[PDB]
PDB file of all heavy atoms in Angstrom:
ATOM      1  N   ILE A   1     115.747 111.320  97.439  1.00  0.00           N
ATOM      2  CA  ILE A   1     114.638 112.231  97.198  1.00  0.00           C
ATOM      3  C   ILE A   1     115.179 113.472  96.496  1.00  0.00           C
ATOM      4  O   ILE A   1     116.385 113.741  96.487  1.00  0.00           O
ATOM      5  CB  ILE A   1     113.899 112.618  98.498  1.00  0.00           C
ATOM      6  CG1 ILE A   1     114.862 113.275  99.494  1.00  0.00           C
ATOM      7  CG2 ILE A   1     113.216 111.400  99.115  1.00  0.00           C
ATOM      8  CD1 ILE A   1     114.272 113.476 100.873  1.00  0.00           C
ATOM      9  N   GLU A   2     114.266 114.226  95.886  1.00  0.00           N
ATOM     10  CA  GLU A   2     114.632 115.460  95.209  1.00  0.00           C
ATOM     11  C   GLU A   2     114.150 116.707  95.933  1.00  0.00           C
ATOM     12  O   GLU A   2     114.494 117.817  95.510  1.00  0.00           O
ATOM     13  CB  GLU A   2     114.090 115.468  93.770  1.00  0.00           C
ATOM     14  CG  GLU A   2     112.567 115.560  93.689  1.00  0.00           C
ATOM     15  CD  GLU A   2     112.030 115.495  92.262  1.00  0.00           C
ATOM     16  OE1 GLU A   2     112.705 116.002  91.336  1.00  0.00           O
ATOM     17  OE2 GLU A   2     110.927 114.930  92.075  1.00  0.00           O
ATOM     18  N   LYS A   3     113.363 116.564  96.999  1.00  0.00           N
ATOM     19  CA  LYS A   3     112.887 117.726  97.741  1.00  0.00           C
ATOM     20  C   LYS A   3     112.558 117.304  99.163  1.00  0.00           C
ATOM     21  O   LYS A   3     112.168 116.161  99.407  1.00  0.00           O
ATOM     22  CB  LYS A   3     111.655 118.342  97.076  1.00  0.00           C
ATOM     23  CG  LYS A   3     110.427 117.453  97.171  1.00  0.00           C
ATOM     24  CD  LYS A   3     109.503 117.600  95.968  1.00  0.00           C
ATOM     25  CE  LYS A   3     108.298 116.662  96.102  1.00  0.00           C
ATOM     26  NZ  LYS A   3     107.623 116.834  97.431  1.00  0.00           N
ATOM     27  N   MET A   4     112.710 118.235 100.102  1.00  0.00           N
ATOM     28  CA  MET A   4     112.322 117.945 101.474  1.00  0.00           C
ATOM     29  C   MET A   4     111.873 119.219 102.174  1.00  0.00           C
ATOM     30  O   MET A   4     112.282 120.329 101.812  1.00  0.00           O
ATOM     31  CB  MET A   4     113.456 117.269 102.258  1.00  0.00           C
ATOM     32  CG  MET A   4     114.758 118.017 102.279  1.00  0.00           C
ATOM     33  SD  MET A   4     116.022 117.157 103.266  1.00  0.00           S
ATOM     34  CE  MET A   4     117.405 118.259 102.912  1.00  0.00           C
ATOM     35  N   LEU A   5     111.012 119.045 103.175  1.00  0.00           N
ATOM     36  CA  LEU A   5     110.514 120.185 103.929  1.00  0.00           C
ATOM     37  C   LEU A   5     111.594 120.685 104.882  1.00  0.00           C
ATOM     38  O   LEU A   5     112.475 119.934 105.311  1.00  0.00           O
ATOM     39  CB  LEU A   5     109.241 119.811 104.689  1.00  0.00           C
ATOM     40  CG  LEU A   5     108.115 119.248 103.808  1.00  0.00           C
ATOM     41  CD1 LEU A   5     106.982 118.703 104.631  1.00  0.00           C
ATOM     42  CD2 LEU A   5     107.589 120.307 102.854  1.00  0.00           C
ATOM     43  N   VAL A   6     111.541 121.980 105.174  1.00  0.00           N
ATOM     44  CA  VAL A   6     112.507 122.663 106.026  1.00  0.00           C
ATOM     45  C   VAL A   6     111.793 123.071 107.303  1.00  0.00           C
ATOM     46  O   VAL A   6     110.710 123.663 107.242  1.00  0.00           O
ATOM     47  CB  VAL A   6     113.090 123.903 105.325  1.00  0.00           C
ATOM     48  CG1 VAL A   6     114.012 124.650 106.265  1.00  0.00           C
ATOM     49  CG2 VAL A   6     113.802 123.491 104.036  1.00  0.00           C
ATOM     50  N   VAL A   7     112.399 122.777 108.454  1.00  0.00           N
ATOM     51  CA  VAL A   7     111.794 123.084 109.744  1.00  0.00           C
ATOM     52  C   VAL A   7     112.777 123.887 110.578  1.00  0.00           C
ATOM     53  O   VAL A   7     113.982 123.917 110.311  1.00  0.00           O
ATOM     54  CB  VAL A   7     111.366 121.818 110.514  1.00  0.00           C
ATOM     55  CG1 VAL A   7     110.275 121.069 109.748  1.00  0.00           C
ATOM     56  CG2 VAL A   7     112.582 120.914 110.804  1.00  0.00           C
ATOM     57  N   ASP A   8     112.249 124.538 111.612  1.00  0.00           N
ATOM     58  CA  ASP A   8     113.106 125.212 112.572  1.00  0.00           C
ATOM     59  C   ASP A   8     113.223 124.351 113.833  1.00  0.00           C
ATOM     60  O   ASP A   8     112.771 123.199 113.865  1.00  0.00           O
ATOM     61  CB  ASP A   8     112.586 126.626 112.858  1.00  0.00           C
ATOM     62  CG  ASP A   8     111.249 126.647 113.595  1.00  0.00           C
ATOM     63  OD1 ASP A   8     110.758 125.589 114.076  1.00  0.00           O
ATOM     64  OD2 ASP A   8     110.690 127.765 113.700  1.00  0.00           O
ATOM     65  N   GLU A   9     113.822 124.922 114.884  1.00  0.00           N
ATOM     66  CA  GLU A   9     114.065 124.200 116.136  1.00  0.00           C
ATOM     67  C   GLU A   9     112.779 123.831 116.870  1.00  0.00           C
ATOM     68  O   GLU A   9     112.816 123.004 117.786  1.00  0.00           O
ATOM     69  CB  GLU A   9     114.961 125.037 117.062  1.00  0.00           C
ATOM     70  CG  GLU A   9     114.292 126.284 117.671  1.00  0.00           C
ATOM     71  CD  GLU A   9     114.255 127.502 116.727  1.00  0.00           C
ATOM     72  OE1 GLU A   9     114.642 127.378 115.534  1.00  0.00           O
ATOM     73  OE2 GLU A   9     113.834 128.592 117.188  1.00  0.00           O
ATOM     74  N   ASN A  10     111.648 124.427 116.509  1.00  0.00           N
ATOM     75  CA  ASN A  10     110.364 124.032 117.069  1.00  0.00           C
ATOM     76  C   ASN A  10     109.633 123.007 116.208  1.00  0.00           C
ATOM     77  O   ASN A  10     108.510 122.618 116.551  1.00  0.00           O
ATOM     78  CB  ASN A  10     109.487 125.267 117.262  1.00  0.00           C
ATOM     79  CG  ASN A  10     109.822 126.007 118.537  1.00  0.00           C
ATOM     80  OD1 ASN A  10     110.332 127.124 118.502  1.00  0.00           O
ATOM     81  ND2 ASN A  10     109.550 125.376 119.677  1.00  0.00           N
ATOM     82  N   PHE A  11     110.254 122.562 115.111  1.00  0.00           N
ATOM     83  CA  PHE A  11     109.601 121.760 114.075  1.00  0.00           C
ATOM     84  C   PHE A  11     108.441 122.522 113.425  1.00  0.00           C
ATOM     85  O   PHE A  11     107.490 121.919 112.921  1.00  0.00           O
ATOM     86  CB  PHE A  11     109.145 120.387 114.611  1.00  0.00           C
ATOM     87  CG  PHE A  11     109.398 119.249 113.650  1.00  0.00           C
ATOM     88  CD1 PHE A  11     110.685 118.763 113.444  1.00  0.00           C
ATOM     89  CD2 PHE A  11     108.360 118.694 112.924  1.00  0.00           C
ATOM     90  CE1 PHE A  11     110.923 117.720 112.537  1.00  0.00           C
ATOM     91  CE2 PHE A  11     108.591 117.653 112.023  1.00  0.00           C
ATOM     92  CZ  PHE A  11     109.871 117.167 111.834  1.00  0.00           C
ATOM     93  N   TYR A  12     108.508 123.855 113.435  1.00  0.00           N
ATOM     94  CA  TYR A  12     107.627 124.660 112.594  1.00  0.00           C
ATOM     95  C   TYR A  12     108.049 124.534 111.141  1.00  0.00           C
ATOM     96  O   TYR A  12     109.242 124.524 110.830  1.00  0.00           O
ATOM     97  CB  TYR A  12     107.674 126.141 112.994  1.00  0.00           C
ATOM     98  CG  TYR A  12     107.189 126.432 114.399  1.00  0.00           C
ATOM     99  CD1 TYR A  12     107.535 127.620 115.036  1.00  0.00           C
ATOM    100  CD2 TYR A  12     106.385 125.519 115.088  1.00  0.00           C
ATOM    101  CE1 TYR A  12     107.100 127.894 116.323  1.00  0.00           C
ATOM    102  CE2 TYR A  12     105.939 125.785 116.385  1.00  0.00           C
ATOM    103  CZ  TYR A  12     106.306 126.975 116.997  1.00  0.00           C
ATOM    104  OH  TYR A  12     105.884 127.255 118.283  1.00  0.00           O
ATOM    105  N   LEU A  13     107.065 124.464 110.249  1.00  0.00           N
ATOM    106  CA  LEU A  13     107.340 124.404 108.822  1.00  0.00           C
ATOM    107  C   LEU A  13     107.797 125.775 108.334  1.00  0.00           C
ATOM    108  O   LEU A  13     107.085 126.769 108.503  1.00  0.00           O
ATOM    109  CB  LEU A  13     106.103 123.947 108.056  1.00  0.00           C
ATOM    110  CG  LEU A  13     106.246 123.791 106.531  1.00  0.00           C
ATOM    111  CD1 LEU A  13     107.285 122.737 106.182  1.00  0.00           C
ATOM    112  CD2 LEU A  13     104.894 123.438 105.887  1.00  0.00           C
ATOM    113  N   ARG A  14     108.989 125.818 107.733  1.00  0.00           N
ATOM    114  CA  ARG A  14     109.610 127.044 107.259  1.00  0.00           C
ATOM    115  C   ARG A  14     109.718 127.121 105.742  1.00  0.00           C
ATOM    116  O   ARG A  14     109.951 128.210 105.203  1.00  0.00           O
ATOM    117  CB  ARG A  14     111.007 127.188 107.882  1.00  0.00           C
ATOM    118  CG  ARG A  14     110.975 127.201 109.437  1.00  0.00           C
ATOM    119  CD  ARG A  14     110.372 128.508 109.932  1.00  0.00           C
ATOM    120  NE  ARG A  14     111.178 129.624 109.442  1.00  0.00           N
ATOM    121  CZ  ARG A  14     110.694 130.769 108.970  1.00  0.00           C
ATOM    122  NH1 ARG A  14     109.385 130.983 108.920  1.00  0.00           N
ATOM    123  NH2 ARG A  14     111.533 131.707 108.546  1.00  0.00           N
ATOM    124  N   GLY A  15     109.554 126.006 105.046  1.00  0.00           N
ATOM    125  CA  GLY A  15     109.578 126.037 103.600  1.00  0.00           C
ATOM    126  C   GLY A  15     109.909 124.664 103.039  1.00  0.00           C
ATOM    127  O   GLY A  15     109.738 123.637 103.702  1.00  0.00           O
ATOM    128  N   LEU A  16     110.396 124.686 101.808  1.00  0.00           N
ATOM    129  CA  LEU A  16     110.693 123.486 101.052  1.00  0.00           C
ATOM    130  C   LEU A  16     111.949 123.769 100.246  1.00  0.00           C
ATOM    131  O   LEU A  16     112.109 124.872  99.712  1.00  0.00           O
ATOM    132  CB  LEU A  16     109.499 123.133 100.157  1.00  0.00           C
ATOM    133  CG  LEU A  16     109.543 122.093  99.050  1.00  0.00           C
ATOM    134  CD1 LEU A  16     108.150 121.556  98.811  1.00  0.00           C
ATOM    135  CD2 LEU A  16     110.050 122.739  97.794  1.00  0.00           C
ATOM    136  N   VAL A  17     112.842 122.789 100.164  1.00  0.00           N
ATOM    137  CA  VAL A  17     114.052 122.909  99.359  1.00  0.00           C
ATOM    138  C   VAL A  17     114.077 121.745  98.375  1.00  0.00           C
ATOM    139  O   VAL A  17     113.705 120.620  98.728  1.00  0.00           O
ATOM    140  CB  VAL A  17     115.318 122.950 100.249  1.00  0.00           C
ATOM    141  CG1 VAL A  17     115.536 121.624 100.971  1.00  0.00           C
ATOM    142  CG2 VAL A  17     116.533 123.313  99.441  1.00  0.00           C
ATOM    143  N   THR A  18     114.449 122.032  97.127  1.00  0.00           N
ATOM    144  CA  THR A  18     114.566 121.034  96.076  1.00  0.00           C
ATOM    145  C   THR A  18     115.992 120.993  95.543  1.00  0.00           C
ATOM    146  O   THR A  18     116.756 121.955  95.662  1.00  0.00           O
ATOM    147  CB  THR A  18     113.613 121.308  94.889  1.00  0.00           C
ATOM    148  OG1 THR A  18     114.046 122.472  94.158  1.00  0.00           O
ATOM    149  CG2 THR A  18     112.186 121.494  95.356  1.00  0.00           C
ATOM    150  N   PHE A  19     116.330 119.861  94.922  1.00  0.00           N
ATOM    151  CA  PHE A  19     117.609 119.738  94.231  1.00  0.00           C
ATOM    152  C   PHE A  19     117.802 120.874  93.226  1.00  0.00           C
ATOM    153  O   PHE A  19     118.870 121.499  93.166  1.00  0.00           O
ATOM    154  CB  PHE A  19     117.679 118.374  93.534  1.00  0.00           C
ATOM    155  CG  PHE A  19     118.987 118.104  92.856  1.00  0.00           C
ATOM    156  CD1 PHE A  19     120.034 117.530  93.560  1.00  0.00           C
ATOM    157  CD2 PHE A  19     119.176 118.430  91.515  1.00  0.00           C
ATOM    158  CE1 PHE A  19     121.252 117.283  92.943  1.00  0.00           C
ATOM    159  CE2 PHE A  19     120.390 118.186  90.889  1.00  0.00           C
ATOM    160  CZ  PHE A  19     121.429 117.613  91.600  1.00  0.00           C
ATOM    161  N   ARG A  20     116.765 121.163  92.433  1.00  0.00           N
ATOM    162  CA  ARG A  20     116.902 122.154  91.367  1.00  0.00           C
ATOM    163  C   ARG A  20     117.150 123.551  91.930  1.00  0.00           C
ATOM    164  O   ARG A  20     117.926 124.328  91.362  1.00  0.00           O
ATOM    165  CB  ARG A  20     115.658 122.154  90.474  1.00  0.00           C
ATOM    166  CG  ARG A  20     115.718 121.178  89.286  1.00  0.00           C
ATOM    167  CD  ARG A  20     114.329 120.597  88.971  1.00  0.00           C
ATOM    168  NE  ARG A  20     114.389 119.281  88.327  1.00  0.00           N
ATOM    169  CZ  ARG A  20     113.515 118.295  88.537  1.00  0.00           C
ATOM    170  NH1 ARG A  20     112.502 118.454  89.383  1.00  0.00           N
ATOM    171  NH2 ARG A  20     113.656 117.138  87.900  1.00  0.00           N
ATOM    172  N   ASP A  21     116.494 123.904  93.034  1.00  0.00           N
ATOM    173  CA  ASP A  21     116.709 125.244  93.562  1.00  0.00           C
ATOM    174  C   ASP A  21     118.075 125.363  94.226  1.00  0.00           C
ATOM    175  O   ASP A  21     118.695 126.434  94.177  1.00  0.00           O
ATOM    176  CB  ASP A  21     115.581 125.617  94.521  1.00  0.00           C
ATOM    177  CG  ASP A  21     114.237 125.751  93.810  1.00  0.00           C
ATOM    178  OD1 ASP A  21     114.198 126.341  92.715  1.00  0.00           O
ATOM    179  OD2 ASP A  21     113.221 125.253  94.329  1.00  0.00           O
ATOM    180  N   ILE A  22     118.573 124.273  94.818  1.00  0.00           N
ATOM    181  CA  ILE A  22     119.924 124.278  95.370  1.00  0.00           C
ATOM    182  C   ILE A  22     120.948 124.492  94.267  1.00  0.00           C
ATOM    183  O   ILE A  22     121.901 125.264  94.422  1.00  0.00           O
ATOM    184  CB  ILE A  22     120.193 122.973  96.136  1.00  0.00           C
ATOM    185  CG1 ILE A  22     119.428 122.963  97.455  1.00  0.00           C
ATOM    186  CG2 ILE A  22     121.675 122.820  96.407  1.00  0.00           C
ATOM    187  CD1 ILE A  22     119.644 121.666  98.251  1.00  0.00           C
ATOM    188  N   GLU A  23     120.772 123.811  93.136  1.00  0.00           N
ATOM    189  CA  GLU A  23     121.718 123.945  92.033  1.00  0.00           C
ATOM    190  C   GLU A  23     121.665 125.332  91.405  1.00  0.00           C
ATOM    191  O   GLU A  23     122.682 125.825  90.908  1.00  0.00           O
ATOM    192  CB  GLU A  23     121.442 122.880  90.975  1.00  0.00           C
ATOM    193  CG  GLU A  23     121.926 121.496  91.354  1.00  0.00           C
ATOM    194  CD  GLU A  23     123.094 121.035  90.506  1.00  0.00           C
ATOM    195  OE1 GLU A  23     123.026 121.183  89.265  1.00  0.00           O
ATOM    196  OE2 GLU A  23     124.078 120.521  91.080  1.00  0.00           O
ATOM    197  N   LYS A  24     120.494 125.967  91.411  1.00  0.00           N
ATOM    198  CA  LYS A  24     120.325 127.290  90.824  1.00  0.00           C
ATOM    199  C   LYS A  24     120.843 128.404  91.726  1.00  0.00           C
ATOM    200  O   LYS A  24     121.044 129.526  91.251  1.00  0.00           O
ATOM    201  CB  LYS A  24     118.843 127.533  90.514  1.00  0.00           C
ATOM    202  CG  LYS A  24     118.402 127.044  89.142  1.00  0.00           C
ATOM    203  CD  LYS A  24     116.889 126.893  89.067  1.00  0.00           C
ATOM    204  CE  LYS A  24     116.186 128.166  89.508  1.00  0.00           C
ATOM    205  NZ  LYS A  24     114.730 127.949  89.724  1.00  0.00           N
ATOM    206  N   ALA A  25     121.062 128.117  93.002  1.00  0.00           N
ATOM    207  CA  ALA A  25     121.401 129.158  93.958  1.00  0.00           C
ATOM    208  C   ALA A  25     122.756 129.782  93.626  1.00  0.00           C
ATOM    209  O   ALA A  25     123.728 129.079  93.332  1.00  0.00           O
ATOM    210  CB  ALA A  25     121.408 128.574  95.369  1.00  0.00           C
ATOM    211  N   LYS A  26     122.804 131.106  93.652  1.00  0.00           N
ATOM    212  CA  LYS A  26     124.056 131.823  93.495  1.00  0.00           C
ATOM    213  C   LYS A  26     124.813 131.861  94.818  1.00  0.00           C
ATOM    214  O   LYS A  26     124.223 131.861  95.901  1.00  0.00           O
ATOM    215  CB  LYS A  26     123.798 133.240  92.990  1.00  0.00           C
ATOM    216  CG  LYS A  26     122.563 133.337  92.104  1.00  0.00           C
ATOM    217  CD  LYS A  26     122.806 134.183  90.861  1.00  0.00           C
ATOM    218  CE  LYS A  26     121.585 134.183  89.940  1.00  0.00           C
ATOM    219  NZ  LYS A  26     120.586 135.240  90.294  1.00  0.00           N
ATOM    220  N   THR A  27     126.132 131.857  94.719  1.00  0.00           N
ATOM    221  CA  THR A  27     126.987 132.080  95.873  1.00  0.00           C
ATOM    222  C   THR A  27     127.498 133.516  95.835  1.00  0.00           C
ATOM    223  O   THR A  27     127.633 134.119  94.766  1.00  0.00           O
ATOM    224  CB  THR A  27     128.161 131.103  95.891  1.00  0.00           C
ATOM    225  OG1 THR A  27     128.995 131.344  94.752  1.00  0.00           O
ATOM    226  CG2 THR A  27     127.658 129.659  95.854  1.00  0.00           C
ATOM    227  N   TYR A  28     127.760 134.067  97.016  1.00  0.00           N
ATOM    228  CA  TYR A  28     128.204 135.451  97.150  1.00  0.00           C
ATOM    229  C   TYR A  28     129.441 135.466  98.033  1.00  0.00           C
ATOM    230  O   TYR A  28     129.341 135.532  99.266  1.00  0.00           O
ATOM    231  CB  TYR A  28     127.091 136.326  97.707  1.00  0.00           C
ATOM    232  CG  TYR A  28     125.899 136.361  96.791  1.00  0.00           C
ATOM    233  CD1 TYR A  28     124.801 135.548  97.020  1.00  0.00           C
ATOM    234  CD2 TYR A  28     125.891 137.187  95.665  1.00  0.00           C
ATOM    235  CE1 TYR A  28     123.699 135.576  96.170  1.00  0.00           C
ATOM    236  CE2 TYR A  28     124.797 137.226  94.811  1.00  0.00           C
ATOM    237  CZ  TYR A  28     123.704 136.426  95.069  1.00  0.00           C
ATOM    238  OH  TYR A  28     122.626 136.466  94.207  1.00  0.00           O
ATOM    239  N   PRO A  29     130.630 135.410  97.430  1.00  0.00           N
ATOM    240  CA  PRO A  29     131.847 135.233  98.236  1.00  0.00           C
ATOM    241  C   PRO A  29     132.168 136.435  99.100  1.00  0.00           C
ATOM    242  O   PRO A  29     132.741 136.270 100.184  1.00  0.00           O
ATOM    243  CB  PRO A  29     132.940 134.984  97.182  1.00  0.00           C
ATOM    244  CG  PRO A  29     132.216 134.867  95.848  1.00  0.00           C
ATOM    245  CD  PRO A  29     130.925 135.587  96.000  1.00  0.00           C
ATOM    246  N   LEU A  30     131.792 137.634  98.671  1.00  0.00           N
ATOM    247  CA  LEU A  30     132.065 138.856  99.410  1.00  0.00           C
ATOM    248  C   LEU A  30     130.982 139.201 100.423  1.00  0.00           C
ATOM    249  O   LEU A  30     131.100 140.237 101.086  1.00  0.00           O
ATOM    250  CB  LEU A  30     132.218 140.037  98.437  1.00  0.00           C
ATOM    251  CG  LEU A  30     133.074 139.859  97.180  1.00  0.00           C
ATOM    252  CD1 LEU A  30     132.977 141.097  96.267  1.00  0.00           C
ATOM    253  CD2 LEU A  30     134.520 139.573  97.551  1.00  0.00           C
ATOM    254  N   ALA A  31     129.932 138.383 100.539  1.00  0.00           N
ATOM    255  CA  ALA A  31     128.747 138.765 101.302  1.00  0.00           C
ATOM    256  C   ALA A  31     129.122 139.226 102.702  1.00  0.00           C
ATOM    257  O   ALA A  31     129.969 138.616 103.362  1.00  0.00           O
ATOM    258  CB  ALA A  31     127.770 137.587 101.393  1.00  0.00           C
ATOM    259  N   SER A  32     128.493 140.324 103.144  1.00  0.00           N
ATOM    260  CA  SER A  32     128.616 140.794 104.525  1.00  0.00           C
ATOM    261  C   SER A  32     127.779 139.898 105.439  1.00  0.00           C
ATOM    262  O   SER A  32     126.544 139.916 105.377  1.00  0.00           O
ATOM    263  CB  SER A  32     128.159 142.246 104.645  1.00  0.00           C
ATOM    264  OG  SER A  32     128.835 143.096 103.730  1.00  0.00           O
TER     265      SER A  32
END
């Protein structure tokens, strides 16, 4: 699949993640 729904520990719907948005995500090596 190219996308799937995101849930929390209650199985509440928290959002959606796709292949394309994962690939576009920036990394922050110094992040606090």
Side-chain angles (χ1 to χ4, degrees):
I1 58 190
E2 68 183 326
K3 69 212 179 52
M4 55 179 175
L5 304 171
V6 176
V7 296
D8 67 10
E9 71 279 6
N10 279 112
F11 221 74
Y12 297 161
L13 182 62
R14 302 289 301 139
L16 169 155
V17 66
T18 70
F19 183 88
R20 271 146 206 144
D21 294 317
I22 287 179
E23 284 249 313
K24 272 161 52 192
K26 329 224 176 87
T27 64
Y28 298 98
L30 315 174
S32 306

